[model samples]
Target chain A: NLTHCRLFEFRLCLLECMSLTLDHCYARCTTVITQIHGSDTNRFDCTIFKTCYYRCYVLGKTEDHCWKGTATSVTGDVGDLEFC
Target chain B: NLTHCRLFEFRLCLLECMSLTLDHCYARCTTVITQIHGSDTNRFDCTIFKTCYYRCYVLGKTEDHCWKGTATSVTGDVGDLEFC
Candidate 1:
């Protein structure tokens, strides 16, 4: 029953991710969003996390690279967000 | 904020996804979860969607393949759950 940050804020941050490098974008998005919305309560962190996971695969990063990241989930989960 | 179905239920379905084929697991999990929890309110639908997105890439499917699927997001978003 946790709420995401405002839709404009959440989508804006996620869309911003697509225009940059995964390493840079993921970190940047999380940091910026953390200030506005804290990561644990909303899977907005996982949104960035999953988006990065999506990007890692496209760049040919396999399970290890795709799955590893600083993004954490609402369940206190991190890195458990696997690719495949 | 909308609540996910019970954690045990949500995760049980997702973990089940790991044990089966991507197409089958995604469909099966969604169907089962849908009975207890509707898809639109929670991103559990996207959770399965993105998980399948992850699996497609590992199977060597590219953007067209990975991004095409039945999963929809709470925002009425679909396939925008792109893989990379």
Candidate 2:
């Protein structure tokens, strides 16, 4: 099992990066309004906040979805990091 | 040297405790990510959002991870704030 501990650093780095710049990177804190059974709801989504060309950068990975930042695990579980 | 003159505001004020809303504050940013001759990979952590227990309850730092929020920072080694 990939414990939250292992992912914590990565998550931390990302969050820090989120606030550090207002350039190409984008970040925000969202509340889980609804949940799909067997799935978490706090979805951390991002887009080219302002830039256009940057869109293609992230899309290169998944053209259909564009840049889907990251999602909490299903089962509405975020381990120790509470969604609130 | 405290460069990069930028600091995002605290999340909008909460409705409760009008005066006690997210009154207290905190803030950071990043620049480059490079090799650490011998150091940490990255660490993730978040502190309370920040707020006063009450309006008049402002004395001797009446604190509380009381209303925990989120913030981020590091060696300014933001791998890629633009890493879309």
Candidate 3:
């Protein structure tokens, strides 16, 4: 559970950083992509990239402005990010 | 929000311990009650006791069998504890 919370915090920090600028985050995404290509690192960075894109661009909000989408509803229009 | 997660973990642990027996937990609750009466400790323990009661006896389920209640609905009959 501590690990779960740490992952959540890391993902949240990534979302906050990406909320500053999607393009900037995408630029950082390139580094992660390179790491995946050049090293034996796990998919952690890749997962963060996807999650940040989903929250920042696709959902169009920061961490504070998203909400958890229901099973039938993929995107919640609430003022809080959906729990990833 | 590490503190928030720790509080949540503590509450969850208390609920799990209480699920074994509400009476047993309430008996332990006496110590918390005494602490509140005898010292300047915060309401953290008292809060946990209330939360456990709400989830266990009032909701009538283990942590695995509770769900977040909506604004209109106070009790969610799902198989997971409601986020307190």
Candidate 4:
């Protein structure tokens, strides 16, 4: 579980780094691209890059979790755990 | 989580087995002991047995998880997950 958590943390860090530009593009796609990437760099191109980066980050996290091992859901009665 | 869940399962099983006798002993400590263990078997002694068994099972799971890996806390924006 800890390994999963750490893997999640690393993926989230990657996601955050990618999002640094993504959120700006989302709100002001064309203008942000022109300012950040340049007029020659199509806003569409920046968007595509950001989107791909995000997907890779997410997939990486998912892969880590899959290999991390089973995540147990909490459901059993606590009393069942208690001993007299 | 799956491994933790399974480990938890084993501990609870031990607790349940112990409880079959412990619960009865708790409610009617003296009488239950006489029937369960023996006329000479001490209730105090049986209580020690259950407590020890419960601790061992719990410790066993704890030990397993410690060797497993880090358990991460979930927080942060989920959107950071989106690539596009």
lDDT of 4: 0.30
- Model 3 per-residue lDDT tens digits across residues A1-84: 122213333345446656675443422332333233321111222222233334443446544443233212322121111343
User: Which model is ahead, 3 or 4, in terms of TM-score?
Assistant: 3
Best candidate according to DockQ: 2
* lDDT against the true structure, each candidate: 0.42, 0.22, 0.33, 0.30
TM-score of every candidate's chain A: 0.37, 0.25, 0.27, 0.26
> Which digits, one per residue and each the tens of the lDDT, describe model 2 over residues B1-84?
112112121222223223554321221101111011101111111111121121112323333322231122221222222210
Q: How high is each candidate's TM-score?
A: 0.26, 0.20, 0.22, 0.18
Question: What residue runs in model 4 are displaced by over 4 Å at the alpha carbon?
Answer: A1-33, A62-84, B1-84
| Ten-residue region with minimum lDDT total, candidate 1 chain B | B70-79
Report the candidate with higher DockQ, 1 versus 4: 1
Candidate 3: what's its TM-score on chain B? 0.29
Off by over 4 Å in 1: A1-11, A17-23, A41-52, A55-83, B1-84
Task: Name the candidate that leads on TM-score.
Answer: 1
lDDT of 4 by residue, B47-77 (tens): 2232333333344645334322212221113
lDDT of 2 by residue, A1-84 (tens): 323112333334334655586321222221111111101211111111111112333435442232232233222122222211
Q: After superposition, how far is residue B43 of candidate 4 from its true place, in Å?
A: 68
Worst 10 residues of 3 chain A by lDDT: A38-47
Q: Candidate 3, TM-score vs. the true structure?
A: 0.22
DockQ of each: 0.02, 0.04, 0.01, 0.01
Pairs of colliding residues, candidate 2: A38-A75, A39-A75, B48-B68, B48-B69, B49-B68, B49-B69
**Number of backbone collisions per candidate, in order?**
2, 6, 12, 11
